[PDB]
Amino acid sequence: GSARLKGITLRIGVIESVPFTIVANVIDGRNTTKLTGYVLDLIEYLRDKMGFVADVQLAPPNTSYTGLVLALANGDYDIAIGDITVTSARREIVAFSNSISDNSMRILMRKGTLIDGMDDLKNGKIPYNRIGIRIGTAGEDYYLREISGGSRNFYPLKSRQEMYDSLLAGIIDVSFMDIGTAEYVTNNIYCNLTLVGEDFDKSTFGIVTPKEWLYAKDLDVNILSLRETGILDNLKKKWFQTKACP
């Protein structure tokens, strides 16, 4: 069957990833967290349009994207919204909404690094333990399928912060990120970093839902309507069209 989400409480899993989901520690005299970003704005549009009660739950620190999907499949959340890549392995265990965004990956490196693209990584110009890969992500899947043939011979990373510190501290030479956030970091957060080469792994982001979900149609119709009316485009411009770096 199918039904409307009007009146329904949804526990919505979100995962820290600037500027999709931005976590601010604030004291207001008690310490609390404030969430903002593209994802929280999207949640507000959907809530206002669909009438569900949003119960937004931030995934614990160092939760992987795979861990978030597994947690939903196990019943810890009703839906999960973020920069979450739709993959065949995930689709085996959860469903996804219509796409909220196209996606691809790029190679991130320190400026001045003598790398010109993916060919250098595939030909072994960089030792493999100096390629940083965020575990439990689509980038790990790609690496294992296309670069290393199954072997996790990369340098593992648990958060964007560890990627930052490792690259800057010269522990790794490159890493992989989704293009939207990769552009964002190199343009606003770490000006010493840059993107190199062509993008790869063309893909999409989707809202994660349970398989065979009662509310699949209601969510999909609404997401498509936001796509059609330019709301998703506006949110992308709002949160991603910025460059603080000189």
Please report whether residue 106 would count as binding ligand PHE according to CB under 6 A. no
Distance in angstroms (rounded) separating the CA atoms of residues 37 and 15: 11
The whole-angstrom separation of Cα 166 and Cα 164 is 6
Looking at the Cβ atoms of 85 and 187, the one nearer to ligand PHE is 85
Residue 134, marked binder? yes
Total residues found in the chain within this entry: 246
227 in contact with a copy of itself (CB under 8 A): yes
Which among 5-13, 82-90, 124-132, 167-175 is the span making contact with a copy of itself, rule CB under 8 A? Answer: 82-90
Q: Which of 38, 52, 65, 154 binds ligand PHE (CB under 6 A)?
A: 65
Confirm or reject binding of residue 99 to Cl ion (CB under 5 A): yes
Per CB under 5 A, which region of 45-53, 74-82, 191-199, 204-212 contacts Cl ion?
204-212
Tell me which residue of 84, 61, 62 sits closest to 72, measured CA to CA: 84
Instruction: Assess contact for 114 and 240: CB atoms under 8 A.
Output: no
- The answer to whether residue 138 forms part of the interface with ligand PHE (CB under 6 A) is yes
Exposed (0-12), middle (13-18) or buried (19+): which is 224, by Cβ within 10 Å? middle
Question: Does 4 engage in binding with a copy of itself (CB under 8 A)?
Answer: no
From the list ligand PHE, a copy of itself, Cl ion, none, partner contacted by residue 181 (C-beta under 5 to 8 A by kind): ligand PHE
Candidate ranges 51-59, 135-143, 147-155, 231-239; the one touching ligand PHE (CB under 6 A) = 135-143
- In the numeric block, which tokens belong to residue 29? 């005299």
Q: Which does 85 bind (CB under 5 to 8 A by kind): a copy of itself, Cl ion, ligand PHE, none?
A: ligand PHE
- CB-CB contact of 81 with 39 (8 Å): yes
With beta carbons less than 8 A apart as the criterion, state whether 218 and 50 touch: yes
| 99 touching a copy of itself, by CB under 8 A | yes
> Could you identify the residue written with the tokens 């992989």?
176
Q: After which residues is the chain broken (C to N over 2.5 A)?
A: 28
Q: How far is the CB of 142 from a copy of itself (least distance, A)?
A: 8
End-to-end CA distance of the chain: 54
The option from Cl ion, a copy of itself, ligand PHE, none interacting with 209 (CB < 5 to 8 A, set by class) reads none
Binding residues for L-glutamate: 83, 85, 90, 134, 138, 178
